[PDB]
Amino acid sequence: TCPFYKKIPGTGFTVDAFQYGVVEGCTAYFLTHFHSDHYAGLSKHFTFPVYCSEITGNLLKNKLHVQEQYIHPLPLDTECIVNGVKVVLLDANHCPGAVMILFYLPNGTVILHTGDFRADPSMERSLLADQKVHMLYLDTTYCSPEYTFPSQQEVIRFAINTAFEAVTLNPHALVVCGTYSIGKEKVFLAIADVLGSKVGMSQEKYKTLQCLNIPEINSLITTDMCSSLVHLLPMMQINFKGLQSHLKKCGGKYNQILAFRPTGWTHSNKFTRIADVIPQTKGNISIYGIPYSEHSSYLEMKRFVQWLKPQKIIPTVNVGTWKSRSTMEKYFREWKLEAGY
Numbered sequence: 001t002c003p004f005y006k007k008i009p010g011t012g013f014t015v016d017a018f019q020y021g022v023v024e025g026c027t028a029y030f031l032t033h034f035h036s037d038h039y040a041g042l043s044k045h046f047t048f049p050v051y052c053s054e055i056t057g058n059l060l061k062n063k064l065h066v067q068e069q070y071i072h073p074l075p076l077d078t079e080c081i082v083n084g085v086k087v088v089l090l091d092a093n094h095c096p097g098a099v100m101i102l103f104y105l106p107n108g109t110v111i112l113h114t115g116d117f118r119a120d121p122s123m124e125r126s127l128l129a130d131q132k133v134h135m136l137y138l139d140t141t142y143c144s145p146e147y148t149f150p151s152q153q154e155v156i157r158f159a160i161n162t163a164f165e166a167v168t169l170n171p172h173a174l175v176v177c178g179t180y181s182i183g184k185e186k187v188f189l190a191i192a193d194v195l196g197s198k199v200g201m202s203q204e205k206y207k208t209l210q211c212l213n214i215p216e217i218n219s220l221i222t223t224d225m226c227s228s229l230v231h232l233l234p235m236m237q238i239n240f241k242g243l244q245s246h247l248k249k250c251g252g253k254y255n256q257i258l259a260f261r262p263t264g265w266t267h268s269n270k271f272t273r274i275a276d277v278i279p280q281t282k283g284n285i286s287i288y289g290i291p292y293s294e295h296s297s298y299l300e301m302k303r304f305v306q307w308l309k310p311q312k313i314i315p316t317v318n319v320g321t322w323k324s325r326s327t328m329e330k331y332f333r334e335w336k337l338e339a340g341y
């Protein structure tokens with residue numbers, strides 16, 4: 001049974017609602033981005049129209065084998081008519097192909113669904129500037145003041161410098177970066193660029209990266225692992241056991257591993273500056289946890305919402321406990337009283 005916060009009132013539309021079977025009255029299923037919690041339920045046997053970005057469409061076709069006739073890609077920043085309702089897709093600053101959706105209801109109501117997003121001041125000069133939003137369906141993943149983390153630029157700077165230093169000291173070292181989904185590709189692409197290397201990876205991961213419309217991608221990645229000094233591995237293998245085993249595999253070409261686990265927030269954010277971050281070390285292996293977020297900080301979320309001044313807010317994350325829901329409602333009221341809407 002589909003929950004209320006995935007329904008768009010006064011339309012036949014749902015958002016990210018693929019795990020409930022056939023939804024009663026739904027004529028179009030929107031998908032905000034290609035992350036499993038959101039696509040959960042789609043497969044090659046789906047026969048309803050799916051509306052999404054070009055990138056999300058490339059992934060549905062190639063990775064999930066959804067048939068072409070049910071995939072409806074829309075350009076960004078463009079007024080489109082779907083089943084007689086005007087819609088716009090906006091970049092969400094999340095993972096590749098992730099969108100926010102603006103719906104202009106036939107009765108005059110305007111609704112923004114953020115999907116997953118990392119709010120940014122640049123969004124204040126999109127097509128959002130032009131008119132009023134009555135309802136906001138908000139990605140509230142980090143809606144609490146304890147959730148602080150640095151910009152994505154500062155995090156990339158720390159990784160580039162760390163990696164370049166280590167490999168310049170030891171030309172026989174290997175950099176490994178963990179992944180479990182699309183997103184956060186800048187981590188491994190920036191490190192490989194500074195080292196003058198391609199990024200090596202499995203055939204399955206190469207196929208995923210080939211769907212993302214990244215410029216010059218053929219110049220950046222490869223399946224020939226041993227030609228490369230940046231490798232990608234599944235996130236679950238980024239530990240001393242998994243990396244010991246990986247170090248065997250190149251035929252003793254490498255005598256040191258430096259590894260990155262991009263997480264979201266961890267409690268070490270409440271005490272440690274990014275510059276001050278230190279790895280866990282065992283012998284010739286070091287693992288760095290780095291706070292590369294593709295969701296809004298509390299401060300970024302507050303700024304966006306105070307700027308948008310919506311009439312109602314519906315959270316889409318952390319909605320399962322009464323304590324969570326109560327905490328989020330208190331912050332929405334402070335923000336409104338502080339700004340005066």
Ligand code: NI
Nearest residue numbers: 033035094116
């Ligand atoms: Ni996501």
